[PDB]
DNA sequence: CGGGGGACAGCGCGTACGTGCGTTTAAGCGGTGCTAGAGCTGTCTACGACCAATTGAGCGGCCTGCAGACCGGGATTCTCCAG
DNA sequence: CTGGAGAATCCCGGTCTGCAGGCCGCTCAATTGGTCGTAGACAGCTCTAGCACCGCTTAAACGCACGTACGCGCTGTCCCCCGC
């Protein structure tokens, strides 16, 4: 029969075949289960969707049609769980959250 | 007939707002390149460089420095002060574990 | 020669969630690096799990356990749900 | 290549502090920052050169720098990955 | 059920003393209780995760060691 | 007792190797000692000899736990 | 069954440096744990390095580079010396 | 380089600490007793490695119109002060 | 309180341009299909340790009295960092 992509079989965008190949080549274990690469591709797709949605929200808030690294940093840092996840990650051209301490405010 | 100079500190707040908004680098590229090549000279001579390494080091350094400054500011505020003393930096790096 | 990435899949997901949103190359490469990083974290944790248990195979179960260990709270729960759903869908078909 | 650490001008240090949200700056700070930055740069560059030489190469690639930073627990995205 | 009150003030005092602290506010003890609770859940969650993936009903010290290792707090003296 | 009580929101009827509890106690005490020392440094930096909870909060904040 | 450790070799090394000093069991356990920790650190570093260069075999050169990367200064120099001399002796032997 | 305003030194205070004694408690210890579950074993079966043939998905190269950047100049806002 | 004044910033047309994104040919990695060996699934067994209980014993926590030093508030000085 005609080849049907495993990604389609699970209905995902991410390439499960490439995932399985990398898993086998990564020396993580001798043999790789059948369902693990699908699980991994689904998880990656889900997280990518989360961050991309937040970044798009931010970019629209800034009113631009393309997501730039600044939008990425804003989205990641504003989310508590994402910021926790990427607690040790540096983003090129990310800038910082515009936060100022209260005591330095003019009074 | 007055020079009309702003009070001490408002310019600082304005520039903080300016720089907490921008994302571009703050250091001149050429001096940074000179410094990094000089530093690398002592581990291996006649070392060539991809630029992408040059600006990657620049981003890493600037981000680390900004984080250190932010920690220093909190440390100084804990001292009920407004200006940072180098002792604040020392305490910050000590607490981080780098000392 | 030729290099592979996640670019097309990232673009597809972007069009899925925000169909009218562009993206710069730099941000796109950042996305790719992020994907690779998560891949390595999850894979290493799964491999350690397998070794700890004296197993020769990495299953979807180990992937789920590693996801639980590496993800915080709601992200972990939703990712677990997504992985389980995709697994059942793939297995049925 | 001598005395480039003074190439880090004081206005640059002000800009860095301001992006860090700092309002008032001592004058005895800048050299301290220079020393800390030099320590950091040495730490990263040593391992970067180690990676470059173990590949028996003569130029340092950014990818090496990424590895060095990862080894130091300071992960950077957007430079090849 | 208030085992969080099982950590008496004298114990916290001794702990600070080994930490080299001379004078202690009265508000400290509750803060310590909270922080310790946070730490305890953070470790125990992962420990139980390991114990479950091993299909077991008893948590082994080795599981705890793994949990500490993956949290960046390596422990020796237990295998 | 505290450890067992905490070990209920994740699963029920869990048994424990004693060594696991011992390791937990050791790690917790070491962590708390380190935090105490950092708090002491913070309080000294505030020209004080008595520790107050804001010192602990600043310490944990700088450590990145917060 | 039987569980292996490093107790005997550590005991021999102790008798080399301090031919009269005893040791408790707990210190033995700590020593074994430390040895294992170093082992996995260095081995993972070497494997990562090898994969970095797209190579199939981990040589002693990889261990040397990994030791340089993981050890600070004089410890690194001395350990490099020990590895080099031991390798040369074994190869000559 | 001028100057304001922040750092800092000094003083008063009152109270929240530390110190010590009497008291209550529960931790700890030794002992007994029970079994659930860890740990180990034999089996076999399903499942994953592996290989040959197939092919189209994705990667490389090309091209472009437009997002966004960059001007310029009014509009608007924020701050500082003399009243 | 409160207008002016000046400086700073925002904003809105108008212009230009590099690259985001799409199109294309190809090819190599994914797929398909079949083989085979073996990892672990699973059932079954043993007995260890973990859980529970109880009775002493006594160290440790607790409550409390008490008193003092320190954290804090306030004030004046001057110098040094900022606006230019």
Residue numbers in the entry:
A (entry chain I): 12 to 118
B (entry chain K): 36 to 134
C (entry chain J), G (entry chain N): 29 to 121
D (entry chain L): 22 to 102
E (entry chain H): 23 to 101
F (entry chain G): 69 to 134
What is written in the article reporting this PDB entry?
The Rpd3 small (Rpd3S) complex recognizes histone H3 trimethylation on lysine 36 (H3K36me3) and deacetylates histones H3 and H4 at multiple sites across transcribed regions. The Rpd3S histone deacetylase (HDAC) complex recognizes H3K36me3 at coding regions and suppresses transcription from cryptic promoters via its deacetylase activity in yeast. Here we solved the cryo-electron microscopy structures of Saccharomyces cerevisiae Rpd3S in its free and H3K36me3 nucleosome-bound states. We demonstrated a unique architecture of Rpd3S, in which two copies of Eaf3–Rco1 heterodimers are asymmetrically assembled with Rpd3 and Sin3 to form a catalytic core complex.
To explore the underlying molecular basis, we reconstituted the H3K36me3 modified ‘designer’ nucleosome and prepared cross-linked Rpd3S–nucleosome complex for cryo-EM studies. Two engagement modes (‘close’ and ‘loose’) of the Rpd3S–nucleosome complexes were acquired in global density maps of 4.0 and 4.0 Å, respectively. Of note, the two CHD domains of Eaf3 became visible in the presence of H3K36me3 nucleosome, with Eaf3-B CHD recognizing H3K36me3 at the DNA superhelical location (SHL) +1 site and Eaf3-A CHD bound to the H3K36me3 mark at the DNA SHL +7 site. In both close and loose states, the two CHD domains are similarly anchored by the H3K36me3 marks. Structural alignment revealed rotational displacement of the Rpd3S catalytic core from the close to the loose states, in which the MID domain of Rco1-A within the right arm leaves the linker DNA next to SHL +7 in the loose state. The nucleosomal DNA at SHL +2.5 is recognized by the HID-C region of Sin3 with multiple electrostatic or hydrogen bonding pairs involving residues Q937, K941, H1221, Q1222 and K1244 of Sin3 and backbone phosphates across the DNA minor groove. Upon engagement mode switch from the close to loose states, the H3K36me3 readout and SHL +2.5 DNA contacts act as anchoring sites to allow rotational displacement of Rpd3S, and the linker DNA contacts are temporally disrupted during the process, reflecting enzyme–substrate engagement dynamics. The existence of two engagement modes suggests dynamic association between the Rpd3S enzyme and its nucleosomal substrate, which may be beneficial for enzymatic turnover towards different acetylation sites occurred to histones H3 and H4 tails.
